[PDB]
Amino acid sequence: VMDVMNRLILAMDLMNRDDALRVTGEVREYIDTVKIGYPLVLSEGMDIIAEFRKRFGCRIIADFKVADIPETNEKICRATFKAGADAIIVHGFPGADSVRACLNVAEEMGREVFLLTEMSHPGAEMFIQGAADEIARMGVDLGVKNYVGPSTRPERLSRLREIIGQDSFLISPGVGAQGGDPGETLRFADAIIVGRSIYLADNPAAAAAGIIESIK
Amino acid sequence: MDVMNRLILAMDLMNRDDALRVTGEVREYIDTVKIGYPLVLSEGMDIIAEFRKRFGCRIIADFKVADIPETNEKICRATFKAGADAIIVHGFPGADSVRACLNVAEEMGREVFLLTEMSHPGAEMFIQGAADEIARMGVDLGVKNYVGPSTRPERLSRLREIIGQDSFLISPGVGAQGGDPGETLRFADAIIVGRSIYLADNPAAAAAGIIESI
Numbered sequence: 001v002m003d004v005m006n007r008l009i010l011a012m013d014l015m016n017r018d019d020a021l022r023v024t025g026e027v028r029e030y031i032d033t034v035k036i037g038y039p040l041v042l043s044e045g046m047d048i049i050a051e052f053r054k055r056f057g058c059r060i061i062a063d064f065k066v067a068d069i070p071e072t073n074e075k076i077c078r079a080t081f082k083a084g085a086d087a088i089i090v091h092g093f094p095g096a097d098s099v100r101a102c103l104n105v106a107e108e109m110g111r112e113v114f115l116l117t118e119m120s121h122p123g124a125e126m127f128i129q130g131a132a133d134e135i136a137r138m139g140v141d142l143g144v145k146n147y148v149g150p151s152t153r154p155e156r157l158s159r160l161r162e163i164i165g166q167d168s169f170l171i172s173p174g175v176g177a178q179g180g181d182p183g184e185t186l187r188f189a190d191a192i193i194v195g196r197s198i199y200l201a202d203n204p205a206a207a208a209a210g211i212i213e214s215i216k
Numbered sequence: 217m218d219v220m221n222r223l224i225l226a227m228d229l230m231n232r233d234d235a236l237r238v239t240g241e242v243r244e245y246i247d248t249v250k251i252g253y254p255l256v257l258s259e260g261m262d263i264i265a266e267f268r269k270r271f272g273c274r275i276i277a278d279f280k281v282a283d284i285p286e287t288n289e290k291i292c293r294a295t296f297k298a299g300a301d302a303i304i305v306h307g308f309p310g311a312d313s314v315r316a317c318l319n320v321a322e323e324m325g326r327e328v329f330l331l332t333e334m335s336h337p338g339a340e341m342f343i344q345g346a347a348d349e350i351a352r353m354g355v356d357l358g359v360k361n362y363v364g365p366s367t368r369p370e371r372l373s374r375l376r377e378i379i380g381q382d383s384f385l386i387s388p389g390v391g392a393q394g395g396d397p398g399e400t401l402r403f404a405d406a407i408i409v410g411r412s413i414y415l416a417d418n419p420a421a422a423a424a425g426i427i428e429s430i
Protein backbone atom coordinates (compact mmCIF):
# COMPACT_ATOMS: atom_id res chain seq x y z
CA VAL A 1 0.00 0.00 0.00
CA MET A 2 1.04 3.63 -0.46
CA ASP A 3 2.96 4.94 2.54
CA VAL A 4 1.14 8.18 3.38
CA MET A 5 3.27 10.45 5.53
CA ASN A 6 1.55 11.22 8.86
CA ARG A 7 -1.59 9.45 7.58
CA LEU A 8 -2.72 12.83 6.24
CA ILE A 9 -3.71 13.56 2.62
CA LEU A 10 -4.27 17.18 1.54
CA ALA A 11 -7.42 17.80 -0.50
CA MET A 12 -6.16 20.70 -2.59
CA ASP A 13 -9.41 22.27 -3.85
CA LEU A 14 -8.20 25.85 -4.25
CA MET A 15 -8.94 27.02 -7.77
CA ASN A 16 -6.00 29.15 -8.72
CA ARG A 17 -2.46 27.99 -9.39
CA ASP A 18 -0.73 30.60 -7.18
CA ASP A 19 -2.71 29.84 -4.02
CA ALA A 20 -2.73 26.06 -4.59
CA LEU A 21 1.04 26.00 -5.01
CA ARG A 22 1.65 28.27 -2.02
CA VAL A 23 -0.49 26.27 0.38
CA THR A 24 0.82 22.91 -0.79
CA GLY A 25 4.40 24.19 -0.43
CA GLU A 26 3.67 25.39 3.10
CA VAL A 27 2.53 21.96 4.26
CA ARG A 28 5.09 19.89 2.38
CA GLU A 29 7.08 19.01 5.53
CA TYR A 30 3.97 17.26 6.95
CA ILE A 31 2.28 15.71 3.86
CA ASP A 32 3.69 13.67 0.90
CA THR A 33 0.31 12.83 -0.62
CA VAL A 34 -1.95 15.39 -2.36
CA LYS A 35 -5.46 14.78 -3.69
CA ILE A 36 -6.19 16.98 -6.70
CA GLY A 37 -9.77 17.21 -8.01
CA TYR A 38 -11.77 18.90 -10.68
CA PRO A 39 -11.98 22.33 -8.94
CA LEU A 40 -8.24 22.78 -9.49
CA VAL A 41 -7.91 20.76 -12.72
CA LEU A 42 -10.84 22.48 -14.55
CA SER A 43 -9.42 25.87 -13.46
CA GLU A 44 -5.74 25.31 -14.29
CA GLY A 45 -5.41 22.31 -16.60
CA MET A 46 -4.09 18.77 -16.21
CA ASP A 47 -0.57 20.23 -16.36
CA ILE A 48 -1.13 21.22 -12.71
CA ILE A 49 -0.31 17.57 -11.86
CA ALA A 50 3.11 17.98 -13.55
CA GLU A 51 3.75 21.22 -11.72
CA PHE A 52 2.98 19.65 -8.34
CA ARG A 53 5.30 16.72 -9.03
CA LYS A 54 8.06 19.12 -10.11
CA ARG A 55 7.64 21.43 -7.13
CA PHE A 56 6.90 19.01 -4.30
CA GLY A 57 7.56 15.40 -5.23
CA CYS A 58 4.28 14.38 -3.59
CA ARG A 59 2.16 11.44 -4.79
CA ILE A 60 -0.96 12.62 -6.58
CA ILE A 61 -4.42 11.10 -6.23
CA ALA A 62 -6.79 12.35 -8.95
CA ASP A 63 -10.16 12.70 -7.27
CA PHE A 64 -12.23 12.50 -10.45
CA LYS A 65 -15.06 10.29 -9.08
CA VAL A 66 -15.16 8.53 -12.46
CA ALA A 67 -18.78 7.67 -13.11
CA ASP A 68 -19.35 7.01 -16.83
CA ILE A 69 -19.89 3.98 -19.11
CA PRO A 70 -16.92 1.58 -19.45
CA GLU A 71 -15.58 3.03 -22.73
CA THR A 72 -15.54 6.60 -21.49
CA ASN A 73 -14.13 5.52 -18.12
CA GLU A 74 -11.16 3.96 -19.91
CA LYS A 75 -10.44 7.22 -21.77
CA ILE A 76 -10.70 9.30 -18.59
CA CYS A 77 -8.28 7.01 -16.78
CA ARG A 78 -5.83 7.00 -19.72
CA ALA A 79 -5.80 10.80 -19.89
CA THR A 80 -5.40 11.05 -16.10
CA PHE A 81 -2.51 8.61 -15.83
CA LYS A 82 -0.87 10.16 -18.98
CA ALA A 83 -0.69 13.40 -16.96
CA GLY A 84 1.18 11.74 -14.09
CA ALA A 85 -1.44 10.83 -11.52
CA ASP A 86 -0.42 7.96 -9.21
CA ALA A 87 -4.02 6.92 -8.58
CA ILE A 88 -7.59 7.83 -9.52
CA ILE A 89 -10.82 7.76 -7.49
CA VAL A 90 -13.73 5.92 -9.17
CA HIS A 91 -17.40 5.68 -8.18
CA GLY A 92 -18.80 2.19 -7.58
CA PHE A 93 -22.49 3.13 -8.06
CA PRO A 94 -22.36 2.80 -11.90
CA GLY A 95 -21.62 -0.92 -11.48
CA ALA A 96 -18.99 -3.56 -12.11
CA ASP A 97 -18.26 -3.05 -15.84
CA SER A 98 -17.48 0.61 -15.19
CA VAL A 99 -15.14 -0.21 -12.29
CA ARG A 100 -13.47 -3.02 -14.30
CA ALA A 101 -12.72 -0.62 -17.18
CA CYS A 102 -10.81 1.60 -14.73
CA LEU A 103 -8.96 -1.34 -13.19
CA ASN A 104 -7.92 -2.55 -16.65
CA VAL A 105 -6.34 0.79 -17.54
CA ALA A 106 -4.66 1.06 -14.14
CA GLU A 107 -3.16 -2.43 -14.54
CA GLU A 108 -1.97 -1.63 -18.07
CA MET A 109 -0.43 1.67 -17.02
CA GLY A 110 0.97 0.56 -13.65
CA ARG A 111 -1.22 2.83 -11.49
CA GLU A 112 -3.97 2.42 -8.82
CA VAL A 113 -7.77 2.69 -8.58
CA PHE A 114 -9.43 3.81 -5.34
CA LEU A 115 -13.10 2.77 -5.17
CA LEU A 116 -15.49 5.27 -3.61
CA THR A 117 -18.29 3.30 -1.93
CA GLU A 118 -20.22 5.56 0.49
CA MET A 119 -19.98 9.36 0.38
CA SER A 120 -19.65 11.72 3.33
CA HIS A 121 -22.36 14.34 2.64
CA PRO A 122 -25.97 14.14 3.91
CA GLY A 123 -27.44 13.41 0.45
CA ALA A 124 -25.43 10.17 0.40
CA GLU A 125 -28.14 8.72 2.65
CA MET A 126 -30.75 8.94 -0.14
CA PHE A 127 -29.37 6.31 -2.57
CA ILE A 128 -25.68 5.59 -2.01
CA GLN A 129 -25.81 4.35 1.59
CA GLY A 130 -28.26 1.55 0.76
CA ALA A 131 -25.99 0.29 -1.97
CA ALA A 132 -22.63 0.87 -0.27
CA ASP A 133 -22.11 -2.50 1.39
CA GLU A 134 -22.80 -4.25 -1.91
CA ILE A 135 -20.57 -1.79 -3.81
CA ALA A 136 -17.74 -2.59 -1.35
CA ARG A 137 -18.30 -6.35 -1.77
CA MET A 138 -18.26 -5.84 -5.55
CA GLY A 139 -14.91 -4.08 -5.15
CA VAL A 140 -13.47 -6.99 -3.18
CA ASP A 141 -14.72 -9.45 -5.80
CA LEU A 142 -13.09 -7.37 -8.58
CA GLY A 143 -9.75 -7.28 -6.70
CA VAL A 144 -9.87 -3.62 -5.75
CA LYS A 145 -7.31 -2.94 -3.03
CA ASN A 146 -7.89 0.76 -2.28
CA TYR A 147 -11.16 2.29 -1.02
CA VAL A 148 -12.72 5.60 0.06
CA GLY A 149 -15.37 5.84 2.81
CA PRO A 150 -16.97 8.51 4.99
CA SER A 151 -15.47 10.12 8.11
CA THR A 152 -18.86 11.57 8.94
CA ARG A 153 -20.43 8.12 9.63
CA PRO A 154 -18.08 6.09 11.86
CA GLU A 155 -20.45 3.08 11.97
CA ARG A 156 -20.49 2.95 8.16
CA LEU A 157 -16.74 3.43 7.92
CA SER A 158 -16.35 0.52 10.35
CA ARG A 159 -18.57 -1.72 8.23
CA LEU A 160 -16.63 -0.79 5.09
CA ARG A 161 -13.36 -1.76 6.82
CA GLU A 162 -14.89 -5.11 7.83
CA ILE A 163 -16.01 -5.83 4.28
CA ILE A 164 -12.65 -4.96 2.65
CA GLY A 165 -10.50 -6.55 5.38
CA GLN A 166 -7.44 -5.27 7.19
CA ASP A 167 -5.16 -5.80 4.16
CA SER A 168 -6.99 -3.29 1.94
CA PHE A 169 -6.10 0.40 2.05
CA LEU A 170 -8.81 2.82 3.17
CA ILE A 171 -8.76 6.63 3.03
CA SER A 172 -11.52 8.84 4.44
CA PRO A 173 -12.75 12.40 3.72
CA GLY A 174 -15.15 14.51 5.80
CA VAL A 175 -12.69 15.37 8.59
CA GLY A 176 -12.84 18.90 9.90
CA ALA A 177 -15.21 21.03 7.82
CA GLN A 178 -17.81 18.29 7.37
CA GLY A 179 -17.64 17.28 11.04
CA GLY A 180 -15.54 14.11 11.19
CA ASP A 181 -12.90 13.68 13.91
CA PRO A 182 -9.30 12.76 12.88
CA GLY A 183 -8.60 10.24 15.68
CA GLU A 184 -11.97 8.49 15.47
CA THR A 185 -11.63 8.16 11.70
CA LEU A 186 -8.19 6.63 12.06
CA ARG A 187 -9.65 3.75 14.10
CA PHE A 188 -10.73 2.39 10.71
CA ALA A 189 -9.07 4.36 7.92
CA ASP A 190 -5.37 4.12 7.08
CA ALA A 191 -5.32 7.82 6.21
CA ILE A 192 -7.56 10.87 6.49
CA ILE A 193 -8.26 13.36 3.72
CA VAL A 194 -8.37 16.99 4.85
CA GLY A 195 -9.19 20.03 2.68
CA ARG A 196 -10.71 23.23 4.08
CA SER A 197 -9.42 22.82 7.69
CA ILE A 198 -5.93 23.16 6.20
CA TYR A 199 -6.24 25.24 3.00
CA LEU A 200 -8.56 27.91 4.45
CA ALA A 201 -6.45 28.33 7.63
CA ASP A 202 -4.51 31.55 8.17
CA ASN A 203 -1.48 29.26 8.64
CA PRO A 204 -1.98 25.98 6.76
CA ALA A 205 1.30 24.60 8.15
CA ALA A 206 0.10 25.19 11.73
CA ALA A 207 -3.27 23.65 10.88
CA ALA A 208 -1.62 20.52 9.48
CA ALA A 209 0.77 20.27 12.45
CA GLY A 210 -2.17 20.60 14.84
CA ILE A 211 -4.10 17.76 13.23
CA ILE A 212 -1.01 15.58 13.27
CA GLU A 213 -0.29 16.35 16.93
CA SER A 214 -3.88 15.42 17.86
CA ILE A 215 -3.50 11.93 16.33
CA LYS A 216 -0.24 11.09 18.12
CA MET B 217 -33.42 24.24 -25.81
CA ASP B 218 -33.86 23.89 -29.55
CA VAL B 219 -31.45 21.24 -30.82
CA MET B 220 -30.96 21.31 -34.59
CA ASN B 221 -32.10 18.05 -36.21
CA ARG B 222 -32.66 16.60 -32.70
CA LEU B 223 -29.06 15.42 -32.90
CA ILE B 224 -26.32 16.17 -30.34
CA LEU B 225 -22.77 15.13 -31.26
CA ALA B 226 -20.81 13.45 -28.43
CA MET B 227 -17.34 14.69 -29.25
CA ASP B 228 -15.13 12.20 -27.35
CA LEU B 229 -12.09 12.27 -29.65
CA MET B 230 -9.01 13.05 -27.57
CA ASN B 231 -6.90 15.08 -29.97
CA ARG B 232 -7.75 18.72 -30.73
CA ASP B 233 -7.01 18.42 -34.46
CA ASP B 234 -9.29 15.43 -34.98
CA ALA B 235 -12.02 16.83 -32.73
CA LEU B 236 -12.11 20.15 -34.61
CA ARG B 237 -11.92 18.52 -38.05
CA VAL B 238 -14.69 15.98 -37.40
CA THR B 239 -16.92 18.59 -35.76
CA GLY B 240 -16.33 20.83 -38.80
CA GLU B 241 -17.33 17.97 -41.13
CA VAL B 242 -20.72 17.60 -39.43
CA ARG B 243 -21.38 21.25 -38.56
CA GLU B 244 -24.02 21.75 -41.24
CA TYR B 245 -26.17 19.10 -39.46
CA ILE B 246 -25.86 20.17 -35.84
CA ASP B 247 -25.80 23.14 -33.52
CA THR B 248 -25.22 21.33 -30.20
CA VAL B 249 -22.06 19.49 -29.16
CA LYS B 250 -21.58 17.51 -25.93
CA ILE B 251 -18.01 17.82 -24.69
CA GLY B 252 -16.82 15.42 -21.98
CA TYR B 253 -13.76 14.65 -19.92
CA PRO B 254 -11.98 12.62 -22.66
CA LEU B 255 -11.56 15.82 -24.70
CA VAL B 256 -11.27 18.32 -21.82
CA LEU B 257 -8.64 16.32 -19.86
CA SER B 258 -6.61 15.82 -23.06
CA GLU B 259 -6.76 19.35 -24.45
CA GLY B 260 -7.92 21.71 -21.69
CA MET B 261 -11.04 23.63 -20.76
CA ASP B 262 -10.07 26.24 -23.40
CA ILE B 263 -11.41 23.80 -26.02
CA ILE B 264 -14.95 24.90 -25.11
CA ALA B 265 -14.31 28.53 -26.12
CA GLU B 266 -12.57 27.28 -29.27
CA PHE B 267 -15.66 25.29 -30.29
CA ARG B 268 -17.84 28.36 -29.70
CA LYS B 269 -15.44 30.51 -31.81
CA ARG B 270 -15.26 28.01 -34.67
CA PHE B 271 -18.80 26.62 -34.81
CA GLY B 272 -21.02 28.83 -32.62
CA CYS B 273 -22.61 25.64 -31.32
CA ARG B 274 -24.25 25.17 -27.95
CA ILE B 275 -21.97 23.25 -25.54
CA ILE B 276 -23.22 20.69 -23.03
CA ALA B 277 -20.46 19.73 -20.56
CA ASP B 278 -20.91 15.99 -19.85
CA PHE B 279 -19.12 15.98 -16.53
CA LYS B 280 -21.56 13.67 -14.70
CA VAL B 281 -20.98 15.77 -11.60
CA ALA B 282 -21.05 13.44 -8.58
CA ASP B 283 -19.37 15.09 -5.58
CA ILE B 284 -20.45 16.69 -2.28
CA PRO B 285 -22.45 19.97 -2.57
CA GLU B 286 -19.44 22.28 -1.93
CA THR B 287 -17.24 20.62 -4.53
CA ASN B 288 -20.16 20.40 -6.97
CA GLU B 289 -20.59 24.20 -6.78
CA LYS B 290 -16.87 24.67 -7.61
CA ILE B 291 -17.03 22.24 -10.53
CA CYS B 292 -20.10 24.02 -11.99
CA ARG B 293 -18.46 27.43 -11.56
CA ALA B 294 -15.30 26.37 -13.40
CA THR B 295 -17.34 24.70 -16.12
CA PHE B 296 -19.60 27.69 -16.78
CA LYS B 297 -16.62 30.09 -16.67
CA ALA B 298 -15.20 28.00 -19.52
CA GLY B 299 -18.31 28.75 -21.61
CA ALA B 300 -20.49 25.67 -21.25
CA ASP B 301 -24.18 26.34 -21.71
CA ALA B 302 -25.24 23.34 -19.62
CA ILE B 303 -23.81 20.59 -17.44
CA ILE B 304 -24.81 16.98 -16.85
CA VAL B 305 -25.10 16.02 -13.15
CA HIS B 306 -25.65 12.62 -11.55
CA GLY B 307 -28.69 12.27 -9.35
CA PHE B 308 -27.52 9.24 -7.35
CA PRO B 309 -25.46 11.33 -4.86
CA GLY B 310 -28.78 12.90 -3.75
CA ALA B 311 -30.74 16.13 -3.55
CA ASP B 312 -28.26 18.43 -1.84
CA SER B 313 -25.61 17.67 -4.47
CA VAL B 314 -28.09 18.41 -7.27
CA ARG B 315 -29.33 21.60 -5.54
CA ALA B 316 -25.71 22.89 -5.42
CA CYS B 317 -25.48 22.60 -9.20
CA LEU B 318 -28.90 24.16 -9.76
CA ASN B 319 -27.87 27.19 -7.66
CA VAL B 320 -24.77 27.88 -9.72
CA ALA B 321 -26.59 27.36 -13.03
CA GLU B 322 -29.20 29.91 -11.95
CA GLU B 323 -26.48 32.45 -11.10
CA MET B 324 -24.74 32.17 -14.46
CA GLY B 325 -27.73 31.70 -16.78
CA ARG B 326 -27.15 28.06 -17.54
CA GLU B 327 -28.93 24.73 -17.32
CA VAL B 328 -28.50 21.51 -15.35
CA PHE B 329 -29.35 18.19 -17.02
CA LEU B 330 -30.08 15.43 -14.43
CA LEU B 331 -28.78 11.98 -15.35
CA THR B 332 -31.09 9.40 -13.85
CA GLU B 333 -30.54 5.95 -15.40
CA MET B 334 -27.34 5.25 -17.38
CA SER B 335 -27.18 3.36 -20.68
CA HIS B 336 -24.50 0.69 -20.04
CA PRO B 337 -25.11 -2.84 -18.62
CA GLY B 338 -23.67 -1.97 -15.17
CA ALA B 339 -26.48 0.56 -14.72
CA GLU B 340 -28.68 -2.42 -13.83
CA MET B 341 -26.73 -3.15 -10.62
CA PHE B 342 -27.54 -0.03 -8.54
CA ILE B 343 -28.73 2.88 -10.65
CA GLN B 344 -31.78 1.33 -12.27
CA GLY B 345 -33.51 0.50 -8.95
CA ALA B 346 -33.12 4.12 -7.84
CA ALA B 347 -33.80 5.79 -11.22
CA ASP B 348 -37.55 6.44 -10.87
CA GLU B 349 -37.00 7.95 -7.42
CA ILE B 350 -34.11 10.07 -8.78
CA ALA B 351 -36.43 11.37 -11.53
CA ARG B 352 -39.13 12.28 -8.95
CA MET B 353 -36.40 14.02 -6.97
CA GLY B 354 -35.63 16.07 -10.10
CA VAL B 355 -39.28 16.98 -10.36
CA ASP B 356 -39.42 18.08 -6.71
CA LEU B 357 -36.25 20.19 -7.17
CA GLY B 358 -37.63 21.89 -10.27
CA VAL B 359 -35.24 20.24 -12.71
CA LYS B 360 -36.42 20.73 -16.30
CA ASN B 361 -33.73 18.85 -18.24
CA TYR B 362 -32.99 15.13 -18.00
CA VAL B 363 -30.83 12.34 -19.45
CA GLY B 364 -31.92 8.69 -19.81
CA PRO B 365 -30.95 5.58 -21.69
CA SER B 366 -31.51 4.82 -25.39
CA THR B 367 -30.56 1.20 -24.76
CA ARG B 368 -33.68 0.60 -22.60
CA PRO B 369 -36.63 2.27 -24.33
CA GLU B 370 -39.12 1.11 -21.69
CA ARG B 371 -37.00 2.82 -19.00
CA LEU B 372 -36.68 5.92 -21.21
CA SER B 373 -40.46 5.90 -21.67
CA ARG B 374 -40.95 5.67 -17.92
CA LEU B 375 -38.60 8.61 -17.41
CA ARG B 376 -40.64 10.65 -19.90
CA GLU B 377 -43.82 9.65 -18.00
CA ILE B 378 -42.43 10.81 -14.66
CA ILE B 379 -41.09 14.15 -15.95
CA GLY B 380 -43.98 14.96 -18.30
CA GLN B 381 -44.11 16.24 -21.87
CA ASP B 382 -42.96 19.75 -20.86
CA SER B 383 -39.52 18.73 -19.55
CA PHE B 384 -36.57 18.33 -21.92
CA LEU B 385 -35.05 14.83 -22.30
CA ILE B 386 -31.87 13.82 -24.18
CA SER B 387 -30.64 10.27 -24.56
CA PRO B 388 -27.27 8.59 -25.19
CA GLY B 389 -26.57 4.99 -26.21
CA VAL B 390 -27.74 5.39 -29.83
CA GLY B 391 -25.74 3.43 -32.40
CA ALA B 392 -22.60 1.95 -30.85
CA GLN B 393 -24.26 0.83 -27.62
CA GLY B 394 -27.28 -0.54 -29.51
CA GLY B 395 -30.02 2.08 -29.20
CA ASP B 396 -32.12 2.96 -32.25
CA PRO B 397 -32.42 6.65 -33.31
CA GLY B 398 -36.10 6.59 -34.30
CA GLU B 399 -37.30 4.56 -31.30
CA THR B 400 -35.36 6.80 -28.94
CA LEU B 401 -37.04 9.89 -30.40
CA ARG B 402 -40.47 8.49 -29.51
CA PHE B 403 -39.58 9.59 -25.94
CA ALA B 404 -36.53 11.89 -25.99
CA ASP B 405 -36.45 15.38 -27.51
CA ALA B 406 -32.95 14.78 -28.84
CA ILE B 407 -30.47 11.89 -29.26
CA ILE B 408 -26.79 11.93 -28.35
CA VAL B 409 -24.52 10.18 -30.85
CA GLY B 410 -20.74 9.69 -30.48
CA ARG B 411 -18.88 6.78 -32.10
CA SER B 412 -21.45 6.12 -34.89
CA ILE B 413 -20.49 9.54 -36.23
CA TYR B 414 -16.96 10.35 -35.05
CA LEU B 415 -15.50 6.90 -35.79
CA ALA B 416 -17.16 6.73 -39.23
CA ASP B 417 -15.18 6.71 -42.49
CA ASN B 418 -17.33 9.67 -43.51
CA PRO B 419 -18.75 11.46 -40.40
CA ALA B 420 -20.87 13.87 -42.50
CA ALA B 421 -22.52 10.92 -44.29
CA ALA B 422 -23.00 9.18 -40.92
CA ALA B 423 -24.86 12.20 -39.51
CA ALA B 424 -26.82 12.69 -42.72
CA GLY B 425 -27.85 9.03 -42.71
CA ILE B 426 -29.03 9.24 -39.10
CA ILE B 427 -31.06 12.38 -39.79
CA GLU B 428 -32.56 10.68 -42.86
CA SER B 429 -33.82 7.83 -40.66
CA ILE B 430 -35.52 10.28 -38.24
Ligand SMILES: Nc1cc(=O)[nH]c(=O)n1[C@@H]1O[C@H](COP(=O)(O)O)[C@@H](O)[C@H]1O
Binds near residue numbers: 118121176194
Ligand atom coordinates in the same frame (compact mmCIF):
# COMPACT_ATOMS: atom_id res chain seq x y z
N1 LIG C 1 -13.97 12.55 -2.71
C1 LIG C 1 -14.82 12.84 -1.70
C2 LIG C 1 -15.74 11.84 -1.40
C3 LIG C 1 -16.60 12.10 -0.35
O1 LIG C 1 -17.51 11.19 0.03
N2 LIG C 1 -16.53 13.25 0.34
C4 LIG C 1 -15.64 14.19 0.02
O2 LIG C 1 -15.64 15.23 0.72
N3 LIG C 1 -14.80 14.01 -1.02
C5 LIG C 1 -13.80 15.03 -1.35
O3 LIG C 1 -12.89 15.16 -0.27
C6 LIG C 1 -12.56 16.53 0.00
C7 LIG C 1 -13.10 16.91 1.38
O4 LIG C 1 -12.60 18.23 1.63
P1 LIG C 1 -12.93 19.02 2.99
O5 LIG C 1 -14.38 18.78 3.37
O6 LIG C 1 -11.96 18.54 4.04
O7 LIG C 1 -12.72 20.45 2.55
C8 LIG C 1 -13.14 17.32 -1.15
O8 LIG C 1 -12.19 17.34 -2.26
C9 LIG C 1 -14.33 16.44 -1.56
O9 LIG C 1 -14.62 16.64 -2.94
Ligand SMILES: Nc1cc(=O)[nH]c(=O)n1[C@@H]1O[C@H](COP(=O)(O)O)[C@@H](O)[C@H]1O
Binds near residue numbers: 069393
Ligand atom coordinates in the same frame (compact mmCIF):
# COMPACT_ATOMS: atom_id res chain seq x y z
N1 LIG D 1 -23.37 10.73 -20.45
C1 LIG D 1 -23.69 9.44 -20.73
C2 LIG D 1 -24.60 8.82 -19.88
C3 LIG D 1 -24.94 7.52 -20.23
O1 LIG D 1 -25.82 6.84 -19.49
N2 LIG D 1 -24.40 6.90 -21.29
C4 LIG D 1 -23.54 7.55 -22.08
O2 LIG D 1 -23.09 6.91 -23.04
N3 LIG D 1 -23.15 8.81 -21.79
C5 LIG D 1 -22.21 9.48 -22.68
O3 LIG D 1 -22.78 9.62 -23.97
C6 LIG D 1 -21.81 9.37 -25.01
C7 LIG D 1 -22.25 8.13 -25.79
O4 LIG D 1 -21.34 8.03 -26.90
P1 LIG D 1 -21.48 6.84 -27.99
O5 LIG D 1 -21.84 5.57 -27.26
O6 LIG D 1 -22.52 7.25 -29.00
O7 LIG D 1 -20.09 6.80 -28.59
C8 LIG D 1 -20.49 9.22 -24.30
O8 LIG D 1 -19.81 10.52 -24.24
C9 LIG D 1 -20.87 8.77 -22.90
O9 LIG D 1 -19.87 9.21 -21.98
